[PDB]
C-alpha cells in the first residue's frame, strides 16, 4: 500500500477560482498528514462527522480533495449548512458532510500589489447550488423579465467578479487557499498508516 499525493495538491502551482473548484480523485493509498508539516503552517483545520486521530485508523471507499481560493472572512462558509454567496453560488457542502477542511493564508502567494484579478467567484445566480455541484457557465444573468442574450446591460449582468487580492488589505480580505477532504464510505481503498 502506497502514499497519497497530498503534497501534489498543496505544493501545487496555483489554485482554481472558487466557482470552478478543482477536485482530484483519491484512491489506493495511505493517509499520512504529517506530510503537510511544512507550509504556511496551515492553521485552520476542522473536521465533521469524523474525529481527529481516528483517521490513521479508518478506511473509506473513495476520498476527494477539492481545492480553491477564497478570501479569509468567507472561510466560515466552507462548513455544512452555511449561507453566503460562497456557500450558495460557489461551493456547497452537504448537511451530513463527513470530512475535513484545511485552509492557510496565501497572502504571500496570490496578492499582487497591482491587484490579482485572476481569482473569480460567481456573484449572480438564480438558485442555490446543490451540495458538491459546480457551475462553470458565464451566461449573462437575467435580472429582469426582459431577456439578455449577450448584451451586458441594465438587468443584464455578467455573473463573475474578481477578488482583487492586494497584500495591503485587512486580513479578512486576504487570499486563502482551501482544501476540502471528502470521506465517502464498495471495497475500501483509502486507509491510514495504522491499517497499512
Amino acid at each position, epitope marked *: 500500500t502506497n502514499l497519497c499525493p497530498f503534497d501534489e495538491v498543496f505544493n501545487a502551482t496555483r489554485f482554481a477560482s472558487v466557482y470552478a473548484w478543482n477536485r482530484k480523485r483519491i484512491s489506493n493509498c495511505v493517509a499520512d498528514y504529517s506530510v503537510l508539516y511544512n507550509l504556511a503552517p496551515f492553521f485552520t483545520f476542522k473536521c465533521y462527522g469524523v474525529s481527529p486521530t481516528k483517521l490513521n485508523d479508518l478506511c473509506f471507499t473513495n476520498v476527494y480533495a477539492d481545492s480553491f481560493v477564497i478570501r479569509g472572512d468567507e472561510v466560515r462558509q466552507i462548513a455544512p449548512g452555511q*449561507t453566503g*454567496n460562497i456557500a*450558495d*453560488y460557489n461551493y456547497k457542502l452537504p448537511d451530513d458532510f463527513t470530512g475535513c477542511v484545511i485552509a492557510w493564508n496565501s497572502n504571500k502567494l496570490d496578492s499582487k500589489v497591482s491587484g490579482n484579478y485572476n481569482y473569480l467567484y460567481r456573484l449572480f445566480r*438564480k438558485s*442555490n447550488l446543490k451540495p458538491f455541484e459546480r457551475d462553470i457557465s458565464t451566461e449573462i444573468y*437575467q435580472a429582469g423579465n426582459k431577456p439578455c442574450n449577450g448584451v451586458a446591460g441594465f438587468n443584464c449582468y455578467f455573473p463573475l467578479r474578481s477578488y482583487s487580492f492586494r497584500p495591503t488589505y*485587512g486580513v479578512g480580505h486576504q487570499p486563502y487557499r482551501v482544501v476540502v477532504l471528502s470521506f465517502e464510505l464498495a471495497p475500501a481503498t483509502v486507509c491510514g498508516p495504522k491499517k497499512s
Partner: antibody, heavy 116, light 109 residues
Framework: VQLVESGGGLIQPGGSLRLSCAAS????????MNWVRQAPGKGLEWVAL???????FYADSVKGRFTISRDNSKNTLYLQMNSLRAEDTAVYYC???????????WGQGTLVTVSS | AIQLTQSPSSLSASVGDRVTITCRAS??????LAWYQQKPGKAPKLLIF???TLQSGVPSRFSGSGSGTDFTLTISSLQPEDFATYYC??????????FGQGTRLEIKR
C-alpha cells in the same frame, strides 16, 4: 422602473406588523433585496437581506423578530415584524441591490410608528 | 465590523462653489464604496459606485474620488437643488453593509 411599498403605521409595543414592497421592471425572485430603515432625523441602518436563492441575513438589532419574505407570484417582497420594540420607529425602505454596483433602485418610504 | 465616518457633519456653501465631503474607513477596502444623495422626505439616490464611477442619470458635476481608505465626494459647480444629506456606503460582498452618518449640505445665498 419602480419600487412601491405599503403596510406601515401605528402599532402598540409588542405588537406585530407586516410591510410589503412591490416591484416594477425586475423580478425580486432574481435579485438581492434589502430593507433599510431610517430613524426620525437619524441616519441609515441596514435591517435585512434576502438572496436570490433565499438565504436571509438580519442586523442583530432585529434578529429573531423580523422575517424578510417574498412572493414570486405577486413579484413582491415582504418584511414581517413581530415582538415590536419601541426603538423600531422609523421610515422603512426596500431596495434592489447589485452588490458591487450599489443599491440602484429604492422604494419611497413607509413610516412604522410603534407607540402605545 | 468596518466603520465609516464622514467629515464634515454639517456644511454650508455658496452656489457654484466646489464642495468636498470625505468618507474615512477604519479598514482599507479597495474601491468598494458608493455615495448616496438624500433630499428631504425622499429615498436616497445612488450617485457613485466603485468609489469613482458615475451612476446613470446623475449630473456630471459629481466627482467620485478617493481610494483605499479615504474618499471624497466633490461637487464642483454647486447648485440650489443639490441641498440634501450625503451618505457613503461599504459595497461589501458579505452581508452587514454600513453607511456613514451623513453630511447635511446647506446652500448659502
Amino acid at each position: 422602473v419602480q419600487l412601491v411599498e405599503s403596510g406601515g403605521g401605528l402599532i402598540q409595543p409588542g405588537g406585530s406588523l407586516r410591510l410589503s414592497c412591490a416591484a416594477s421592471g425586475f423580478i425580486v425572485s432574481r435579485n438581492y433585496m434589502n430593507w433599510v430603515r431610517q430613524a426620525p432625523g437619524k441616519g441609515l441602518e441596514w435591517v435585512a437581506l434576502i438572496y436570490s436563492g433565499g438565504s436571509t441575513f438580519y442586523a442583530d438589532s432585529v434578529k429573531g423578530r423580523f422575517t424578510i419574505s417574498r412572493d414570486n407570484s405577486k413579484n413582491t417582497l415582504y418584511l414581517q415584524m413581530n415582538s415590536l420594540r419601541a426603538e423600531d420607529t422609523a421610515v422603512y425602505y426596500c431596495a434592489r441591490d447589485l452588490v458591487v454596483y450599489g443599491l440602484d433602485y429604492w422604494g419611497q418610504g413607509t413610516l412604522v410608528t410603534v407607540s402605545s | 465590523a468596518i466603520q465609516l465616518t464622514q467629515s464634515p457633519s454639517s456644511l454650508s456653501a455658496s452656489v457654484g462653489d466646489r464642495v468636498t465631503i470625505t468618507c474615512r474607513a477604519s479598514q482599507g477596502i479597495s474601491s468598494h464604496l458608493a455615495w448616496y444623495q438624500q433630499k428631504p422626505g425622499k429615498a436616497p439616490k445612488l450617485l457613485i459606485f466603485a468609489a469613482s464611477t458615475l451612476q446613470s442619470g446623475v449630473p456630471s458635476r459629481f466627482s467620485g474620488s478617493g481610494s483605499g481608505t479615504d474618499f471624497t465626494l466633490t461637487i464642483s459647480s454647486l447648485q440650489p437643488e443639490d441641498f440634501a444629506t450625503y451618505y457613503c456606503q461599504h459595497l461589501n460582498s458579505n452581508p452587514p453593509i454600513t453607511f456613514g452618518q451623513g453630511t447635511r449640505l446647506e446652500i448659502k445665498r
